[PDB]
Symmetry: C2
Subunit: 77 residues, 2 copies
Amino acid sequence: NFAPLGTITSSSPTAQPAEVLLQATPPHRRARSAAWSYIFLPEEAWCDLTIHLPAAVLLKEIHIQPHLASLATCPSS
Amino acid sequence: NFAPLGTITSSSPTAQPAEVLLQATPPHRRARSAAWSYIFLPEEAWCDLTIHLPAAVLLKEIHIQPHLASLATCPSS
């Protein structure tokens, strides 16, 4: 897992910092709050997150874990 | 709402009774257990529920409310 060594950023100027998404140890699977949250404007359809790595890597898999306490907030695609 | 006056049944001989789904007052939004549950066999794809009414009615709408405490169990279609 190379994610903890990189830097995460977003193009929305009003987004909560998301450096907590890269921690190696996953949060508890019964937490009452999502680690990272994003609020959509009524005319918005997509949000973006960019991860920069310090050096080139042969990539094979991407893992994303949503907030299990409430799956109504899982991204649609 | 004509549902409370009808009878509900299912074609699976090993299904939990589902007469509680017809109650007029909805359960609490923060309940820790689903009102009705069904367990799928590994070769099963669909389950069925039939509601019989005592007299003919001009039907317009159908409402179904899943278990909000865990949306991973919401039916796919």
